[PDB]
Structures are given as structure tokens and as C-alpha cells.
Paper text:
Here, we explore the viability of such a mechanism by inserting one de novo designed alpha beta protein into another such that the two beta sheets are combined into one. The backbone geometry at the junctions between the original domains is regularized, and the sequence at the newly formed interface is optimized to stabilize the single integrated domain structure. Crystal structures of two such proteins demonstrate that complex beta sheet structures can be designed with considerable accuracy using this approach and provide a proof-of-concept for the hypothesis that complex beta topologies in natural proteins may have evolved from simpler beta sheet structures in a similar manner. Our success in designing larger beta sheet domains by recombining smaller independently folded beta sheet proteins suggests a similar mechanism could have played a role in the evolution of naturally occurring complex beta sheet proteins.
A first extended sheet protein was created by inserting a designed ferredoxin domain into a beta turn of the designed TOP7 protein to create a half-barrel structure, with the two sheets fused into a single seven strand sheet flanked by four helices. The CD spectra show both alpha and beta structures. The most similar SCOP domains had weak TM-align scores (0.54 and 0.51), and the sheets in these matched structures have different connectivities than those of the designs, suggesting that the two designed proteins have novel folds. The beta strand connectivity is quite different in the designs than in these closest structural matches.
Author numbering: 3 to 162
């Protein structure tokens, strides 16, 4: 139902906790576990993605994420979202890519994208939470339009 990768790097200590929480009641638990950990041991660098399937879900998740890093006292924050489109007609896939990169760049946004046979990935950097959210509605209406599969991972790394 919902993917979670998490990375702590410390030089000498590293960790790649990787989850699938299905309820998302779960999700708060595991987020919570992690935090009690860093309050203790204290990490140098953390990164956390949470994968979604809906524009609405995307909203929840960076918010949830924001709360986390915020509680963590991590102000040197670094966002990112990687939209994933899936569909057989490679035409409409591209049509989406164009339109998607457009809007990402209508703001100060830097994209990378890869298309590897009917799977098109589009990463997106250098924007506020406010943009990402608005860029994800756009991701979702695009999916709906040409009836392609969408996914929206919401990364957010941060050091301190």
C-alpha cells in the first residue's frame, strides 16, 4: 500500500531501513520508532522517501515528513519529488513528460527524467513544499487525462 525508504549516514554507521506499511496507522509507528532513535544516538544525515498513489496522498506525506524533520530540529532541509508514470501508449507518456517538465520549470524547478520502455520517471528539485504540492495535482490530472498509471514519491533529506 505505501513504500518507505529511510537512510541514516554517519561515516562508520549507515542504515537502509525499508518498509511497506499497508494501513498507514503503521506508518506513524515506524516514523515514531526512528525519531526516538535519533533523539538518542543522533544522526548526521537523514533522508526519507514515502511513496504514494494520489495527489492527495502526496500532500499528506510531505506534511507528515515536514513534521518529522521539524520535530527533529533539522532546518537544513532538502525536498524532492519523483513522479512515476506507467502506460503502454508511449505517445501519451511523452505528451505527459513535456507538460510535466514545463510546469516544473514554470517555477525555479530542476528536473531529470528517464524513459525506459513504458516507464517514465521524472525527478524534481529546488522547490518549496508549496510548489511540490501544486506540481502533484498536475501530476495527477495528467495521469487521469491519458489514463496512465502514476506514482509520487516524496523524498526529503536533511543534514544537521
Amino acid at each position: 500500500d505505501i513504500q518507505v525508504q529511510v537512510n541514516i549516514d554517519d561515516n562508520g554507521k549507515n542504515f537502509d531501513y525499508t518498509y511497506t506499511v499497508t494501513t498507514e496507522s503503521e506508518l506513524q509507528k515506524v516514523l515514531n520508532e526512528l525519531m526516538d532513535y535519533i533523539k538518542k544516538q543522533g544522526a548526521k544525515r537523514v533522508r526519507i522517501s514515502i511513496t504514494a498513489r494520489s495527489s492527495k496522498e502526496a500532500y499528506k506525506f510531505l506534511a507528515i515528513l515536514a513534521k518529522v524533520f521539524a520535530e527533529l530540529g533539522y532546518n537544513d532541509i532538502n525536498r524532492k519529488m519523483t513522479v512515476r508514470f506507467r502506460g503502454d501508449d508511449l505517445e501519451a507518456l511523452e505528451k505527459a513528460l513535456k507538460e510535466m517538465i514545463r510546469q516544473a520549470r514554470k517555477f525555479a524547478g530542476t528536473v531529470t527524467y528517464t524513459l525506459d520502455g513504458n516507464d517514465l520517471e521524472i525527478t524534481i528539485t529546488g522547490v518549496p513544499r508549496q510548489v511540490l504540492e501544486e506540481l502533484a495535482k498536475e501530476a495527477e490530472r495528467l495521469a487521469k487525462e491519458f489514463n496512465i498509471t502514476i506514482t509520487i514519491t516524496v523524498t526529503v533529506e536533511g543534514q544537521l
